A paper describes a structure:
Phosphoribulokinase (PRK) synthesizes RuBP from ribulose-5-phosphate (Ru5P) in the final step in RuBP regeneration. Here, we report a carbon metabolic pathway involving RuBisCO and PRK that can regenerate RuBP in methanogenic archaea. Archaeal PRK homologues show approximately 30% amino acid sequence identity with PRKs in photosynthetic organisms and form a clade clearly distinct from those of bacterial and plant-type PRKs in a phylogenetic tree. We analysed the specificity of the M. hungatei PRK (MhPRK) homologue for the known P-loop kinase substrates pantothenate, thymidine, uridine, cytidine, ribosylnicotinamide, fructose 6-phosphate, AMP, ribose 5-phosphate and Ru5P, but found that it showed kinase activity only for Ru5P.
MhPRK forms a dimer with dimensions of ∼105 × 50 × 40 Å3. The two protomers within the dimer are related by approximately two-fold noncrystallographic symmetry. Each protomer consists of an eight-stranded mixed β-sheet (β1–6 and β8–9) core surrounded by several α-helices (α1–α9) and β-strands (β1′, β2′ and β7). In dimeric MhPRK, the central strands β7, which consolidates the formation of the dimer with the larger dimer interface (1694.6 Å2), and β8 form the dimer interface. Conversely, MhPRK (homodimer) and RsPRK (homooctamer) differ in their quaternary structures and manner of dimerization. The N-terminal domain (1–198) of MhPRK resembles that of RsPRK, whereas the C-terminal domain (199–319 for MhPRK) is relatively different. Two sulphate ions are positioned at the active site of the N- terminal domain at the edge of the dimer in MhPRK. One interacts with Arg59, Arg62, Tyr98 and His100 side chains, and the other interacts with the main-chain amides of residues 27–31 in the P-loop along with a water molecule that interacts with the side chains of Ser31 and Thr32. Except for Arg62, these residues are highly conserved in all PRKs; they are responsible for binding of the phosphate group on Ru5P or ATP, as shown by the X-ray structure of the protein complexed with one sulphate ion in the binding site for the phosphate group on Ru5P, as well as mutagenesis studies of RsPRK. Mutagenesis and structural studies on RsPRK have also identified other residues responsible for Ru5P binding (His45 and Lys165) and ATP binding (Arg168). These residues are also structurally and sequentially conserved in MhPRK (His55, Lys151 and Arg154).
Author numbering:
A (entry chain B): 3 to 99, 103 to 155, 164 to 319
B (entry chain A): 6 to 155, 164 to 319
The structure:
Amino acid sequence: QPENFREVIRHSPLVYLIGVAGDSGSGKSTFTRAISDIFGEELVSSITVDDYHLYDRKTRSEMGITPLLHTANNLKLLEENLMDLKAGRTIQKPVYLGTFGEPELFSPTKFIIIEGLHPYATKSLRALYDYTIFVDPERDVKYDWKIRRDNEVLREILQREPDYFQYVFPQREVADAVIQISYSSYGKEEGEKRNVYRVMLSMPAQEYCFEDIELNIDLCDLFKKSSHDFSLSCISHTPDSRNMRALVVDGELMPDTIHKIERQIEFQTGISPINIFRGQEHITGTDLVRLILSWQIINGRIALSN
Amino acid sequence: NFREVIRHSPLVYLIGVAGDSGSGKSTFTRAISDIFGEELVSSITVDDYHLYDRKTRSEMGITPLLHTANNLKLLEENLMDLKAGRTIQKPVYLHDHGTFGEPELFSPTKFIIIEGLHPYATKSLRALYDYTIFVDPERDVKYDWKIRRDNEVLREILQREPDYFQYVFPQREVADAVIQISYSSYGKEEGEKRNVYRVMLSMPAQEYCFEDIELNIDLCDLFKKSSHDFSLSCISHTPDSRNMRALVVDGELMPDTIHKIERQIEFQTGISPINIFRGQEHITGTDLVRLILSWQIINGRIALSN
C-alpha cells in the first residue's frame, strides 16, 4: 500500500528539523519560502540564525568583527533552543532586527526551518537536523545579485570571502542537498530577464523513494518551432571528498511537464494550489528544483516514520 | 487508429533512408521492420542497383558512390511502379564478394523502406517519398564501423570521401529527419561496449501531433547510486542552412522511462511486445531515436490519411 505524508505526521509528535545554510545574498530565502508555500503555514514555522548575533550592528563595526565568524554568534544558545524544540518544548529566543530586540516565545510546529549562515556549522548542531540544504551559487551570479540590490561594494565581498570559506562553506560537505545556480548556457541575460539559470541539484546516494515521481517530456512538442530550449542531465561527481549525483537543469520546460509532480505533492501536503508559485508560460530550473527539493522532504519525512 | 487507416487504402507509404556506407542504415531499417512487423513492412537496398561489380570498379578506379555507377533511372521506374501497387522485377547485388546476383520479383507492401547510398539523390526521386531519413555519423564513428568492422577499407575510404560529399551528402538537406551519431561525452569506449553514443535528431517545423508522446524521467531514481548518467536537451541549429530543432540524447535511461511510449506504439501497430528490440536493462540514445522515428512514421501515415 502507498504511504501518505499526512498519515505519517498526524499520529506523531516528532518535530522535523530543516537547515538551510548559505552565504548572505546566496538566495537562501527563495528556498525557505518555497518550503513554506508548499507545506503551509500550519505545518511550517521558521527561525533565522541572525536572531543569535552576540554583538549588534553597531558594536560589530567598531570591533571590525564580521557576522561570518562563529564566535560572533550564540551557537550554544541555538543548539540549546533546537534541542528543546525537538522535544516539543516552547522556547524563549532572542530576536535581532539594526539591533537586539525583545526576546520571543517561539513554539514548535511539525516542521521548522532554521535558516542562516551557521544553521549547522558544528557537529553538535548538525546531528540535530533531519534534513539539510546548502545554497551555493557561482561567484559571478551571486555578486551580480548583490549589485542588483546594494565596484561601489567590491571590497565587502572579497573582504569576507575568506571568513565564508572558513566558517560557512564547510556545512556544504554535510548537506543532504546542495543547490548551485549559475548563468544559463543560453546567456547571462536570461538570468534576470526570464529567471532562466543553469541550476544544479546535488545529493548523496538516494536511500529511499516512497513513490514514482516523474517528469513528463513530450517528444513531439519539442520539435514544434517556438519550442524553448532546455537541457536536463544527471551525472556523478565527487565534491568535498564525497560521492554525489548532480541533476542539472537548464532552459525552460512546458508547464505540462510537471502537472503530475505538482498534483502528487499537493495531494500529499493537502496544500494547494501550488502552480501559483512558478511560471505560467514556462517552467525553469529553479522551479523544478523547488518541487524536487520539496518532494525530497516529504520522502525523507516518510522514510523517518519507518 | 493506425492499423485501421491502412485498411481500405491501396496507398503505399514510401520511406527513404540515405547515408554513406557503414553508417547504420541497415540496422535502423531493421528496427523499423521489427516495430511495424514483417507483414506490413518490406525493404530494398539501393545497392542492388550498382552498374559495376567490385572487380570491375577496381579496374576503373571508380567508386560505387557515383550516380553514373548506379542504375538510378531503373530504381525510380521501379519505385513509381511500386507506389501504383504493381509488382516489379529488380536487380540484386551480392555483397559476399561484390558480384551481381539473380534478378528478383518484388511485389508492393504498404510500407516500403528504401535504404542505400542514393535513395533520393535526385530532385526527381525525392519527389516520390513520403518520409525521408538521413543517418549522418561523425567520421571516426562512421569509419570505426568499417576499418574495424572489416587494407582495402583504408584506401577505399580515402577514395570515397570526395564522392560521398559530392553524391550522397546532398540528400541530407532535403530529409525530414537527420540522425547524427558521435562518441558519447562519456566513455568513447562505451559506444562499442554499451551502444552508448551521443545521438542528435533534427527535424524541421513540428506541427500536427496525432497524440501525446512523453518520456517519463523519474526524479528520485536518478539520484540512486546505481543510476547511470544521461543528458537530454533540445536546441535549434541550422544544418544545410535551414531551421530545424534537435533532440540531443546521450547516456542511458531506465527502461520504464519509455514503457508508455512503447505501449502506445504497440497499440497502433498491433505488433508486440517490442521491448525485446532494445536494451533490457538500459535505453540508449539510439534505442530512443528509433522509437521516436517509428512514431513519426505512424504520425506521418495518420496525417497523410487526413
